Symmetry: D2
Subunit: 400 residues, 4 copies
Amino acid sequence: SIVVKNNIHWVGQRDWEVRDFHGTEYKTLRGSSYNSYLIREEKNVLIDTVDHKFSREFVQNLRNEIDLADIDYIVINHAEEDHAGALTELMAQIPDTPIYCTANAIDSINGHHHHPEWNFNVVKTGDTLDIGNGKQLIFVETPMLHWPDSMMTYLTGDAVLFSNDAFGQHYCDEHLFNDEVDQTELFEQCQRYYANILTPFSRLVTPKITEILGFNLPVDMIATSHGVVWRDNPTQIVELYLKWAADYQEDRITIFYDTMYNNTRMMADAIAQGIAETDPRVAVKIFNVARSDKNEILTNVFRSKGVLVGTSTMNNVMMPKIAGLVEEMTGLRFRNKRASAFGSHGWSGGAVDRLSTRLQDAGFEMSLSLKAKWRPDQDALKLCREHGREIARQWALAPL
Amino acid sequence: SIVVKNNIHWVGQRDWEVRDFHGTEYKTLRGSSYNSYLIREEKNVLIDTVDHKFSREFVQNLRNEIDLADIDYIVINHAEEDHAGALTELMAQIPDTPIYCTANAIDSINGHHHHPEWNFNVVKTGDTLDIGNGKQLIFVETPMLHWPDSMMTYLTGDAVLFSNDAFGQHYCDEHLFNDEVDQTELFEQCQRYYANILTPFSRLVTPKITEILGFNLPVDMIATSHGVVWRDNPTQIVELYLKWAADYQEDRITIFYDTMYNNTRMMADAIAQGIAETDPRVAVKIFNVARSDKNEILTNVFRSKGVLVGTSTMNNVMMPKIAGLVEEMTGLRFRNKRASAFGSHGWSGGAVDRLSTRLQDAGFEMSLSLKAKWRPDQDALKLCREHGREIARQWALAPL
Amino acid sequence: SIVVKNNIHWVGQRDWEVRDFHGTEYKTLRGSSYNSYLIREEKNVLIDTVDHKFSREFVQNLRNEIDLADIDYIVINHAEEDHAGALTELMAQIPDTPIYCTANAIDSINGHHHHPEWNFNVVKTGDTLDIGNGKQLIFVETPMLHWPDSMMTYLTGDAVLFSNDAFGQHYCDEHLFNDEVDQTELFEQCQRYYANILTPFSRLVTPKITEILGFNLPVDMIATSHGVVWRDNPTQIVELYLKWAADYQEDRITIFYDTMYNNTRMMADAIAQGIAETDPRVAVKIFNVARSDKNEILTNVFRSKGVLVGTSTMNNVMMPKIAGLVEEMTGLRFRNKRASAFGSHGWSGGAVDRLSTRLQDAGFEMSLSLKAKWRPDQDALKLCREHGREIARQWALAPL
Amino acid sequence: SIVVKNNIHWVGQRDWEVRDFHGTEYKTLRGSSYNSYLIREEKNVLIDTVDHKFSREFVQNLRNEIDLADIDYIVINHAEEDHAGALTELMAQIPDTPIYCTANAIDSINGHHHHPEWNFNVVKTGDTLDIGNGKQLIFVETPMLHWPDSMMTYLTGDAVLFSNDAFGQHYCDEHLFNDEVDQTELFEQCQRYYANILTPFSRLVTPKITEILGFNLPVDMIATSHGVVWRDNPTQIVELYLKWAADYQEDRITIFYDTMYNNTRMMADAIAQGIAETDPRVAVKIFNVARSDKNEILTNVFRSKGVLVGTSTMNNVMMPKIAGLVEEMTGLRFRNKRASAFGSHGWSGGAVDRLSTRLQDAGFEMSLSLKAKWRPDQDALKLCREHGREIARQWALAPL
Ligand SMILES: Cc1cc2nc3c(=O)[nH]c(=O)nc-3n(C[C@H](O)[C@H](O)[C@H](O)COP(=O)(O)O)c2cc1C
Ligand SMILES: Cc1cc2nc3c(=O)[nH]c(=O)nc-3n(C[C@H](O)[C@H](O)[C@H](O)COP(=O)(O)O)c2cc1C
Ligand SMILES: Cc1cc2nc3c(=O)[nH]c(=O)nc-3n(C[C@H](O)[C@H](O)[C@H](O)COP(=O)(O)O)c2cc1C
Ligand SMILES: Cc1cc2nc3c(=O)[nH]c(=O)nc-3n(C[C@H](O)[C@H](O)[C@H](O)COP(=O)(O)O)c2cc1C
Ligand SMILES: [Fe+3]
Ligand SMILES: [Fe+3]
Ligand SMILES: [Fe+3]
Ligand SMILES: [Fe+3]
Ligand SMILES: [Fe+3]
Ligand SMILES: [Fe+3]
Ligand SMILES: [Fe+3]
Ligand SMILES: [Fe+3]
């Protein structure tokens, strides 16, 4: 275990190997960690657990730290499998140990473990749990951030906010604190996490943070459920979350597509050229969805003021990877972004119009589409390049 | 080169390595071949070329077989990149050599090569091209089988049908003829090809074959553009195409899904059990679309009387791989098949209803959906197992 | 659960999703199953368990079949994680239940579970365990087939041989018996399993089967730990094991390589041509190790009389995937096979000689190597094709 | 095209999609570019070409910039396929155009293209080529940096060094110059390139740079063949090459392994713990070679003072991915690094000793190995953790 602060002990688990989260929809290229915390005052409190894969390691490591019978309270901020996966194994040893959680957590815990006989304690915002030595736990409900059962736990005196998933990131390192790791890699994992997971709940982020700030609770450290502990200027991640929640966008355009004979690819490259020579302010990224990291594409979409999506017509519909990606974007609900569909066709086409409509369904403000037949020649590439010019002028943040 | 029959020489190319066709939407697990043919009578005729990757090998191998200036006619049955990719390199050496093709082929050839100065000869069904020694080529238009430019070329006397893509398969072998290869692997590649490529054009297959049969043309061999040459009972593949085109289905049910915590997986397995114990006649296959070969899933769908598709609710929509697969099935237009959507959810759900509707859009006759919350317990698995029973009884080909 | 025969119940688990075994060194393209059996006579005996992934399901399904306290004996034929993974979870409920296994199994069970306080019973070949109703279990030691702890359990009366890994295969199907599944797929998975796993233990196969046959024990069914139960002509898989163990080879040559600019690939294709035109009897397979299924290559190697391995020179050594594959072949110990190293180089080369030596280390009888500089021209390809001729004539099983 | 400086025009090609170089041994996660340059003074000089994939685009784009007959000289700094792939297509239009290159380049050009009838001009260090307007090209031989044919071309007046592969990186961006792109991403791609490609030629780097500096030639820009053009403080990449060539290492330890039951993984994690609590200065990275990016592991190895490699015993040999990686490291020739082999075994083992020996063959100074049986218990993990302590104390750059 690792000492977080005073009697707060990190009893979590590092995961150097993990590459797949949420099925295969989240790629953790830099591993992850599952942070659990054991507070040892007059009362002994365990906060969250770890992933199911390390259930047996978690209990044994917990035994080495403390006798399991001496654990007074268990706090579950969130009942996902990567935080409550090792709960059943633990409760098999100490079944009478009370669990403090939200009302919705009772539904989610019993939903997976099927053990309603456990001693649950419903907590709501403002409720306190005394642990002795002048210290107490304060619970703060955060529904749909990013689950209905989600909440945070604050420890007075030590001024530590156990925020669970919030302000966390999938980043595995031997060092525990934020000032001990690579800042660039840390920022990348943080933004990647928010973009792919927390984007559709952005409307709830700012009012919830504003509510918490009103409590006037001092914050020395922010101990999340994933990655580093924020101890050096810990509110820096809170400020990033405030920026990212306000329909975040940079002067940036992301282009992604799928192609069978690179005809649409040629269109994509030509569009990008037109943009660059019209608006030097705009940063442009190009991706082949069949050949690229999906989460990286989505992170760029999150950072972009607008996107262009390319697809060829395949059996009168669009290419499935493009279709799948558009479906996911519809769930993420990007805001204040604009889009334009493009692609090549053989005869009757139809996929480009089909794509433009589904992009509109995803919440994008649509501009005119760009269509081309077979392989674009020199004249056709001019029209594609011209299309990029028109997009740049329309989506300009400022004149010229 | 290899002797097909008499003065017919296979001057094509084997591809032991190829794994990706049509971007990444067709997996060739057993490689492929690109069959080109050189007929040497009084006239010298080249029929089709090969993939663009082997353009330089093709011309050189062609030089070793014959002086390029001695090539009298070039026949293009189909102007795709895996058949007309090496055309530009070839025509760069013999630009005055006439090209015989369909009217639509002029649009597709010029669409990729951008060389309209070539000497094109529009051919239609019934047209002949004499090559001497009492032999002639007969052209047969086959629009939308599977491209608008598609046609077949028949050689009299030798009774050889150059069918291009039709009756072909992606199967690489040192032996050229069908009776020289593994029959099981051959059948698998044939059915895989039809299911993933030719399914939406099934309505055009039977009338076109019936039209060709009316010509009363003897068939000794069928020389396709991919895989083996059919010489031993060559009409066996024609009969398979007739069977596969008639909205083909077996007493079979395919179940596929994507899952994040295996909750939907548990539902899938429970459904399958209910089916097996209700209708022993039904063959059941189960796939995880994130962990399986996509084309294999589609081949099973093609063979199935009905399917069940599973997805969890992710950001109020369905999982993208399921969405992508449903989009592709909408293009393939499966017929006389039935479907049922299922999956697990956390709170409000909605993905299952969303999936059922899109399956209906794909042409499936929909049965009732199956929904479950979180991880299915013993009682919940009973309902899933019961759902499989109801599906089996409804989709029964015969009573009991 | 499923009735195997009389009071024998299959209480195992199907795995439709599994694709990776032994890390990533075995690909199960058709899933797998983990077969556990519950015999209910006067005594109740459980034979083996399942993979750790389905541990909670295994125990729960076992409860639905019988009260856990009514389980009299537990038989562990083999203590691997895919057979003894759910042991700890089970023994946590019934710790006093005796375990019957080999002496080496005590080391392997305690090696993973760390529960030496369990009540182990060492069994040896010929030892019996009465279960009532005139029936008894007979244990047969099979060390290094394929583990030191490996054994088989025979049930008298019902004449059922519980062979564990032996005669098994990774094949998932809703039907349990061999006469109920696809015979071609069954054969493929059986041979694939033997080639990649049981090849180095081939010398031990024949004497052990001969020893078992000497017991004159009637065999009605063979219940393995993976895949189908052999009930219809169960000795068919025994004869296959006898054939495969005798340094199995067909008139077949497998060629595999890795390449950076397809120079070595061009050599590979030319070699294959030389073989085919010299010995038409020989079947030839070509693989790119970077683009193919590794286990399929090894299955072909197992079936081949000889192989040719290709590599280019990379930093004065060979390409890593070739190095890795040769290392694995060194462990598999193929017998009575011949080999030839080939490949392209830029200047000083050396990788081909390095490869030839390591192939000799793997047990292959080496023929002359083939070297070429850069991209092989027409003259160079003649030498490559000529090399295939020389190899074909040398490795001929019969003249011409 | 893009203006580099004055009459120097970038006529290269961006590659947003490329992910595989040298077969599959180099992963370009951020794409790449192929830089070609057209100098238009009194004479017109083309410097290098692009990859074969963009050959038709290269020639066409070149036509749009200038009439091909007006091209006076062609300079080939390096005849690899990603620099000379489009040479044949170009020379097919202007065969009489002279080619300036090293003596070894004649062998490498003719080795691939097979056109020795081309007009080659052998150049050596110090040789000049006048292009008018007071400007001239100066050639500098750089054999085995990183090919025998490799050289650089310097343009007087404009003070531009065409370094080809040297100082380049695989990084695709719409902006051409180094001060216009993300500095962190640029540094990562630069170091990644050197570590995986230029490491074994490090002994040649420093003397060659020293030789060039002796020429006292002003360097305003460095135009490479891959990635950005260095115009803003161009000597920053030169200093990095000087640092990286001097047997570069940081206070860092990289641990990588392959595992079948995570037994070796448990050992790896325990070792890392022992190191971290013994020497807090040391940075530790852990990788599973079957689940990680191979090039990233090698970049970490390059940056590390020492490594620990893990493998289990599989058929009396080591796991193939470990074998393959060690083979590649043997070619890369890392210097002044130390190593320790570890891993789990079932009975007789042997793979750990086998690995330790091959690590010694790769040039690592070996410390004692670490062996464990089956799954490491609490006592075994103590020894593993203790091993990390012993390694940390031994490999310390400074006391404590
Ligand atoms: C499998 C397949 C299906 C196709 N279906 C259609 C279609 O339904 N309508 C159409 O106009 N073109 C169709 N085409 C032609 C392509 O749209 C055309 O080749 C396009 O220009 C190539 O796009 P890409 O290279 O950018 O992927 C199809 C092509 C293929 C290979
Ligand atoms: C990223 C993510 C998004 C989710 N979105 C929703 C949602 O929008 N509505 C809902 O009811 N449940 C949602 N859930 C909960 C899952 O649907 C629930 O855990 C389900 O039972 C698990 O399905 P599976 O394990 O079969 O994939 C979400 C879960 C995750 C991980
Ligand atoms: C990264 C790299 C390293 C190389 N190292 C060597 C070498 O050490 N010795 C040599 O003779 N050639 C070397 N070469 C040249 C190749 O061996 C040569 O290009 C070969 O003909 C190509 O083989 P392939 O296309 O079959 O992969 C190297 C090439 C590359 C790209
Ligand atoms: C396919 C296979 C082959 C094995 N071969 C050997 C062997 O030759 N010698 C040995 O001592 N153990 C052998 N073992 C046992 C492993 O070394 C043992 O399970 C080890 O502790 C697991 O290592 P890992 O989980 O780190 O991969 C083998 C295991 C498997 C699955
Ligand atoms: Fe979560
Ligand atoms: Fe989480
Ligand atoms: Fe086609
Ligand atoms: Fe085709
Ligand atoms: Fe086993
Ligand atoms: Fe097994
Ligand atoms: Fe190079
Ligand atoms: Fe290069």
